[PDB]
Symmetry: C2
Subunit: 246 residues, 2 copies
């Protein structure tokens, strides 16, 4: 049968962390950059990556979250009587993940400074503005050799290993913190108390012409399952879904 | 010779048609819409494309150009041995694209009225807002069956078939009405009058480490040839390039 995951942030920093995790993956979509399309896709996701670091301070809270997962993993270390080896190198994976970020360059500086990127990013604010005759540097850049762009791209993506990785760990260690408890929604409606929880990972069943519309006040969240167009396939119903509170 | 074709729009109206022709090309380029990237690339294009239409009325500008080129071809028909039926037959395509257009659903509406798009479009201005948790409605659309979207993609394309049929011809007739003269540039500089010309097609050479920086004063235009890399690789000398006033 058909299945779909629905991640949703329960707080203001997971929102940011997921936004970025999405932005960083997009850099790597295919990566034979060849066409106008190719380059723009990249720089928009980079510029958008940059726009976040205009605010936020993504370095400090990742650090603090890594110490959290350590203090978590700490809890499990002594007893129970299963897994010691894996978890220790898993902690040492965080210690090195944590360590490397703070001493690394002011995150995003390389691409912020970059000349080719500098140009395209100011022209990403006009509709159809970033084009051939508008970005004469871009237009030639594409005409250069096939593996010249690939030498500038890798360095472009590689500059954010301090951020990419640190995050990549933290988020794996979140997504495993909560098992999938099988719920049921009355009247196409549901509430609970998230608690400390950062994320919801809502698994949706038979594709009911429905999707999770989540709201929340303080710690408590309210899921309401909306259908695709109001009077198109209206079946609010009693749903039998699966939801984990990471 | 690894010739680097630089097209430059000398008037405000050509500047517009290039923006349009380029944005449409960026729809049909990728095509299957498998990924999230593949989505956002398509939806963002449309977004921007819709923002251009709300300016200047391209319907009532393009038609004036479809009316122009018709009369231009009509000059050649008088004589001599060169062409007769083949141009007469072409004129029927320009009458066709011209009327097909003059009687078409107000350009944009099918993509503004369609709900999924205008939703996505009001969120684009936010960096990384086009995210599963801020627009879950796109997640499902991207989880829908492999066949579903294609029919929905091909509609949104055909919505814009009247314009694409009209434009592509007007630009391709314009990129034919003139040939490539060979010209020279001292101290990386050039000046010349455009006159009746809508465009500058300009073939530089095998990446001479140079892009042209065209400016304008009325119908007069000037090229300041700039090199790659700032205070490093300045190589303007006397340069030998070729141009086309189209």
């Amino acid at each position: 049968q058909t299945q779909v995951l629905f991640e949703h942030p329960l707080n203001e920093k997971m929102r940011t962390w997921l936004r970025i995790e999405f932005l960083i993956q997009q850099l790597t979509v295919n990566l034979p950059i060849v066409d106008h399309a190719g380059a723009l896709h990249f720089f928009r996701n980079v510029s958008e990556l940059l726009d976040v670091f205009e605010r936020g301070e993504v370095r400090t809270e990742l650090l603090k979250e890594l110490d959290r997962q350590q203090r978590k993993l700490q809890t499990w270390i002594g007893v129970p009587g299963v897994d010691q080896s894996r978890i220790e190198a898993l902690i040492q994976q965080l210690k090195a993940a944590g360590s490397v970020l703070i001493s690394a360059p002011r995150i995003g500086q390389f691409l912020r400074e970059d000349r080719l990127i500098a140009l395209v990013r100011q022209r990403l604010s006009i509709p159809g503005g970033c084009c051939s005759f508008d970005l004469p540097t871009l237009h030639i850049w594409l005409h250069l050799p096939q593996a010249q762009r690939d030498s500038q791209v890798e360095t472009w993506i590689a500059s954010l290993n301090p951020l990419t990785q640190a995050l990549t760990m933290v988020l794996d260690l979140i997504r495993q913190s909560a098992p999938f408890r099988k719920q049921t929604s009355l009247n196409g409606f549901y509430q609970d108390n998230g608690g400390d929880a950062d994320l919801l990972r809502l698994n949706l069943s038979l594709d009911s012409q429905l999707y999770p519309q989540i709201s929340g006040h303080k710690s408590r969240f309210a899921i309401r399952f909306m259908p695709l167009d109001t009077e198109n396939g209206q079946v609010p119903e009693r749903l039998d879904f699966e939801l984990a509170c990471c």
